[PDB]
Design an enzyme around this catalytic site. Structure first.
Site, mmCIF file in Angstrom:
data_model
loop_
_atom_site.group_PDB
_atom_site.id
_atom_site.type_symbol
_atom_site.label_atom_id
_atom_site.label_comp_id
_atom_site.label_asym_id
_atom_site.label_seq_id
_atom_site.Cartn_x
_atom_site.Cartn_y
_atom_site.Cartn_z
ATOM 1 N N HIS C 143 -1.956 6.251 4.768
ATOM 2 C CA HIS C 143 -1.234 6.176 3.485
ATOM 3 C C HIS C 143 -1.422 7.400 2.590
ATOM 4 O O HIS C 143 -0.669 7.571 1.642
ATOM 5 C CB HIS C 143 -1.612 4.927 2.694
ATOM 6 N N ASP C 180 -0.327 0.904 13.135
ATOM 7 C CA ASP C 180 -0.784 0.062 12.029
ATOM 8 C C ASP C 180 0.477 -0.644 11.497
ATOM 9 O O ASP C 180 1.565 -0.073 11.496
ATOM 10 C CB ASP C 180 -1.483 0.952 10.984
ATOM 11 N N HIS C 182 1.439 -1.396 8.566
ATOM 12 C CA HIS C 182 1.958 -0.840 7.326
ATOM 13 C C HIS C 182 2.559 0.550 7.570
ATOM 14 O O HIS C 182 2.109 1.290 8.444
ATOM 15 C CB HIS C 182 0.839 -0.839 6.254
ATOM 16 N N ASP C 268 -3.748 -4.539 12.366
ATOM 17 C CA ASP C 268 -3.255 -5.486 11.370
ATOM 18 C C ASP C 268 -1.901 -6.132 11.717
ATOM 19 O O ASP C 268 -1.429 -7.012 10.982
ATOM 20 C CB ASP C 268 -3.267 -4.908 9.935
HETATM 21 O O1 LIG Z 1 -3.933 -1.599 6.260
HETATM 22 C C1 LIG Z 1 -3.429 -1.313 5.187
HETATM 23 C C2 LIG Z 1 -3.454 -2.076 3.885
HETATM 24 C C3 LIG Z 1 -2.978 -1.525 2.754
HETATM 25 C C4 LIG Z 1 -2.950 -2.096 1.376
HETATM 26 C C5 LIG Z 1 -2.500 -1.256 0.352
HETATM 27 C C6 LIG Z 1 -2.434 -1.668 -0.982
HETATM 28 C C7 LIG Z 1 -2.809 -2.955 -1.344
HETATM 29 N N1 LIG Z 1 -2.739 -3.344 -2.709
HETATM 30 N N2 LIG Z 1 -2.825 -4.544 -3.068
HETATM 31 C C8 LIG Z 1 -2.785 -5.027 -4.394
HETATM 32 C C9 LIG Z 1 -3.216 -6.331 -4.645
HETATM 33 C C10 LIG Z 1 -3.208 -6.877 -5.922
HETATM 34 C C11 LIG Z 1 -2.763 -6.102 -6.983
HETATM 35 C C12 LIG Z 1 -2.329 -4.800 -6.752
HETATM 36 C C13 LIG Z 1 -2.324 -4.266 -5.465
HETATM 37 C C14 LIG Z 1 -3.264 -3.804 -0.317
HETATM 38 C C15 LIG Z 1 -3.336 -3.386 1.028
HETATM 39 N N3 LIG Z 1 -2.782 -0.194 5.274
HETATM 40 O O2 LIG Z 1 -2.551 0.396 6.484
HETATM 41 K K LIG Z 2 2.689 2.176 10.997
HETATM 42 ZN ZN LIG Z 3 -2.452 -1.301 7.733
#
Ligand SMILES: O=C(/C=C/c1ccc(/N=N/c2ccccc2)cc1)NO
Ligand SMILES: [K+]
Ligand SMILES: [Zn+2]
Ligand SMILES: O=C(/C=C/c1ccc(/N=N/c2ccccc2)cc1)NO
Ligand SMILES: O=C(/C=C/c1ccc(/N=N/c2ccccc2)cc1)NO
Ligand SMILES: O=C(/C=C/c1ccc(/N=N/c2ccccc2)cc1)NO
Ligand SMILES: [K+]
Ligand SMILES: [K+]
Ligand SMILES: [K+]
Ligand SMILES: [K+]
Ligand SMILES: [K+]
Ligand SMILES: [K+]
Ligand SMILES: [K+]
Ligand SMILES: [Zn+2]
Ligand SMILES: [Zn+2]
Ligand SMILES: [Zn+2]
Lengths: 369, 369, 369, 371
Positions: C143, C180, C182, C268
């Protein structure tokens, strides 16, 4: 006979962080851990045992009422209050100054409920609605002096409660008996110059904080003679604690004639506690509570308020606390399942060095008017 | 020269259950908990610190080799071996005997790897490939006598290793020095009639078991005089432990002239341990290790093998263990971040009762030929 | 021949704090919790299973070497590097910019080791010392775009590796295949204008981030046609994933002729993951790995480097990862104990909407030169 | 601005010992490493209880003590043989699995199983007979997988069936409905009332999620009970739009046709967007709307008599907000946002997909046979 009991859900939500004692620290190689030594689960397990044992059916639940800024300012400085608001407003909270005292985001709300729980139970015991009670509060209080947070303590809960009774209820004399294993330095500080609050601390000598709790710390001015430290050596158990109660604590209370007794009720003197080296068992705490409640019956119309301080064994603290609750209710319905395992370890003979430590304090009783 | 180090992932997988000490029990109102007092994370955190601190770069990693039946029968009875593999072969495992000592289905695999870690390190030191080492094993050993499992111990790791050194390597004299805070009753039992393995235990008097570890327990027959117990009072710290090392332990080792020293290295005498009342800090353990390693250098060409026993502070045990590792490697690169906090608590002055307890043992040295 | 494997103890020490996803917050009544969704134990349990299964005896352990400033600047801006240095140097660390991606004090050390694990493994595969490998790194990478941290990623580990392969290892073409669940928005951003790194992302459509991963995002300038997104619908399982591999991913790689394939290996997409809605089982990941390794054998002399991205089931992720490790070693010695339980839930039929989503990408393949 | 809403929590619901495994027990030969929190660990439900208190919702609720279910209570839903077997496991020094390899219990664990079923009974007793308007029994262990003759899927006794049995036999209600929106098929409930038109059993669930072999729309009951079991299997990835379409097209019409005297909701939150044990996309706002629709239906057709009884749900992070949304719809006091709302709303699930529509349309013809 009506016994008040304070538990607020948020007492279990205190955020002690991801460290052991200080914060986790990569450069120091202090690995993060789920349960800080002071994690709230220890006290929550005490509450849950109060419920699961059926003791809760013999208690009168009392809601905490959040301490106001003005309530807090009876015991603490404006700068301290401002600093706690600052730390609590931070997105993940933070350390409050001494490096081992974390407060979560919004954690000031819980500190207000903790002090306010002690105040509300004090109020309702003093009216006669309740005969006595136990405020199972968190965070603890007794290390916090006028101008700081210290040793897991944000505000001095028992001093906020004593301050209320003096300011509002027309009580001329109040006693705070602290049997948390650590020196009640904050309480000693707050009332140092004041003979209207007799402050007693039974503790392991130099356990925490490091350079305090000596029997020569006796107060100042009009308050001289109205602070009594009883430092005991590491390894002291039920015999030493009960000797200290009989030779020093109970005679001090009878000499002073408080109108209300507040107990700083820690269980960190237990045989299984990681944060001190004492040998008290649940039966020891039972006998301590029984003696103090009976003293209150004799001298101040039974007006006794227990307020939770420390204790760090999630395994054993609940049974130590339950013993005290059973002494308040008079319903003795569960054994200590650790009794036989711990009874064989010792602490139930008064050792010569323990006897001598207690004897050092007996002369200070003569100055209590 | 090269220092061996044993860690096996499965040492961290020992299933200690959902109880605190005994199993969770609803009628006793013992609430389940994630971490039993003996949970493997404590020892895993030690291993992770050995790596994260960089100490692993100065060590030679040695793989555990599973202890065979032949290995185990040098320390234990045929019935005990059958009983553990009977228990381990059960669909969900079971009780080994005493109500605080678990085994999983296939948990014998870990018990074999623990004992085998001690044997494999012993083999590599005693054959000259390594100068010394630390086997960070789990489950522990020293409470298991010839015919039973006890106090979290399935097999007596240090006795399995000593038995190997005697029978396979042809060593005529081995010493096992146990500074776990609990009495090494299992080790004492196994070698009770045997002067070819000198067994020394320093421990808190009557901590566990409640009925052994008196200095009158001296062995029998040809073994009379070749078991030495040094029971110490609760509250004993760095000063008492180092006084014991210099006045009793080092002289006993010099009188006996072992060809290999095995150390039952527990850290449950630490200042923060829940399962004893002693006050040793990482620096105390450091000095204990330095003294023993220097003794080994003088009398048995540095042939010293440390084998993990107990210790129950996940917070502080890692630093206690790291200090011992650093004394083996000679690379002292990380401060103890608890030092200042714990130093103030005491334990650093030799008390008269501590001195008297150690003095009782000095006359026993005369009988070690 | 040899399969490299990177694990560094500090990957398991990343402090994810006391919240669930965002920080705990008392006003919002988000109660603190022991294990944040991204807690490092999930990846540690994968490492521990690699060892306990015996796969570690078939792998060549490769030490991570901290990524240098020069390494990081091949993927990120000078401003981002300096900002990470700034945040890591703060006394208790802080927010990297997005409100949720945190670094502790000194946390830059772990971020450098994570990226550096990918670099070191890439070097040792490119020289021919190793045929392939798995870098089980943490924190994750995909990311993080050129000028920021995002989504718990500090540096884009696979882009740091790709940049190293381009500038130091002489490779004219590199491919990053991200499975992944995401969208790999960071990787997409870094190489957006660059046809020398083909960037492919298979992901759940609009899972995270909320506004990216459309198949219309194809790069720009000389890079137009060299970024391929394959967004799939929630509920896609083994059939959809394997069809996407056969119809789109493997054809893209073959048409591109990279000299090295880097896989952004998240788990994931698993059937038991809380942070996406996909149905891939360990056998699905096994087949994805087998296909990609075999593709590498055909097109780039077997040069394939797997680098850990996300995955949040501590229960199941270890078996998904182990399946990939087994395809690298060729030693298939442990069953997935969840196989029958999860196989009954479905995902093993190619649904029309899944087929349609994959067919949308096919025309993009014609433009790869 | 609300009538009396009952709420059941008992400390022991939080003390259920789920062991040291993930799903099945830890197993060294299989290399399933021990873990602190089993998927079904009681902390998830406790965090819901604690949020009910910390949010201030508890100030608007009437706490109702659980009363242990008697043998007679349990025998209205289960066989004598099943009751007898649960005693044995409950005597074991560390308890154990009860049959299916994923359903752990403790020495004494029957105490908690009786208190769980008894919480549902006691709330039912007080709602029927008019002391309370409605309520939520936050029980544990759950119930809906336990059929007449067994424990299954973390369920010892079928709590909602024990409650319905009491309502039928003790209170003399002629018609009861059990609406189960736990994401897994309520096979136990379906089994218990299979031959019986006096309890209409409805289950919305992810198709073949658990168990692997039940929940088809052709499972309609038998004999006089033919037409009084309704399954609505939905595809993985279904979210708020699918669930609300299912409520509007099938569930609510079914309840209106059947005219139950009491509606019991098997209230699981394992259909949530963040649940590990299914693949659905329901948010807290989704559960809010589902609850609002069902309570309003009860207000229209059975004097508001509706009893929610906790079933599954496995996100300790998100389940408390899903559960709180349902509690807020009972009290009418809406004082806390879902802090995950924006994060989850972008993920999808709020458009009705063609395959979701089709799965629901398949069930509409079964409404014609409800008399
Ligand atoms: O495996 C991952 C997970 C990424 C991920 C990125 C951002 C996230 N943010 N979550 C929130 C939860 C509550 C409030 C604001 C944001 C939660 C998970 N990325 O590859
Ligand atoms: K991906
Ligand atoms: Zn992920
Ligand atoms: O219950 C209590 C709390 C006592 C107490 C609190 C915190 C302590 N601090 N420890 C450390 C440890 C490591 C580094 C700095 C400081 C020591 C004792 N007293 O009543
Ligand atoms: O490290 C050790 C620990 C020894 C130890 C041995 C036995 C213990 N058992 N305690 C109990 C407590 C309650 C009921 C039964 C038994 C607890 C700790 N030995 O070296
Ligand atoms: O809420 C729920 C969850 C049900 C559920 C039922 C059965 C499950 N079985 N899991 C396994 C996993 C591995 C091996 C055997 C069995 C797992 C979850 N039901 O309503
Ligand atoms: K005073
Ligand atoms: K004190
Ligand atoms: K001997
Ligand atoms: K010892
Ligand atoms: K590109
Ligand atoms: K029916
Ligand atoms: K259902
Ligand atoms: Zn204390
Ligand atoms: Zn020990
Ligand atoms: Zn469910």
């Amino acid at each position: 006979h009506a016994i008040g009991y304070v538990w607020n859900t948020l007492y279990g939500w205190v955020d002690t962080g991801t460290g052991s004692l200080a914060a986790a620290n990569l450069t120091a190689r202090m690995q993060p851990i789920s349960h800080h030594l002071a994690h709230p689960d220890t006290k929550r397990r005490f509450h849950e045992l109060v419920c699961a044992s059926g003791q809760i059916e013999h208690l009168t639940p009392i809601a905490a009422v959040a301490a106001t800024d003005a309530d807090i300012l009876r015991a603490h400085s404006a700068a301290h209050l401002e600093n706690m608001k600052r730390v609590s407003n931070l997105p993940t909270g933070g350390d409050t100054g001494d490096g081992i005292t974390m407060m979560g985001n919004g954690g000031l709300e819980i500190a207000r409920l903790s002090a306010g729980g002690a105040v509300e139970l004090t109020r309702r015991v003093a009216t006669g609605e309740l005969s006595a009670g136990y405020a199972l509060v968190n965070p603890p209080g007794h290390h916090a002096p006028h101008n700081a947070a210290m040793g897991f303590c944000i505000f001095n809960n028992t001093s906020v409660a004593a301050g209320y009774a003096r300011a509002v209820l027309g009580m001329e004399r109040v006693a705070i008996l602290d049997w948390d294993v650590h020196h009640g330095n904050g309480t000693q500080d707050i009332w140092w110059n004041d003979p209207s609050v007799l402050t007693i601390s039974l503790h392991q000598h130099l356990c925490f904080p490091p350079d305090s709790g000596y029997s020569t710390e006796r107060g100042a001015g009009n308050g001289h003679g109205y602070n009594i430290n009883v430092p005991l050596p590491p390894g002291s158990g039920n015999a030493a604690y009960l000797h200290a109660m009989d030779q020093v604590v109970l005679p001090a209370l009878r000499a002073y004639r408080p109108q209300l007794i507040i107990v700083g009720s820690g269980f960190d003197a237990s045989m299984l506690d990681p944060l001190a080296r004492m040998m008290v068992t649940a039966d020891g705490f039972r006998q301590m509570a029984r003696r103090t409640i009976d003293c209150a019956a004799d001298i101040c119309d039974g007006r006794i308020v227990f307020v939770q301080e420390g204790g760090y064994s999630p395994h054993y603290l609940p049974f130590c606390g339950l013993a005290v609750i059973e002494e308040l209710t008079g319903v003795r319905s569960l054994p200590d399942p650790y009794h036989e395992f711990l009874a064989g370890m010792g602490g139930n003979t008064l050792l010569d060095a323990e006897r001598a430590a207690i004897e050092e304090i007996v002369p200070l009783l003569a100055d209590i008017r």
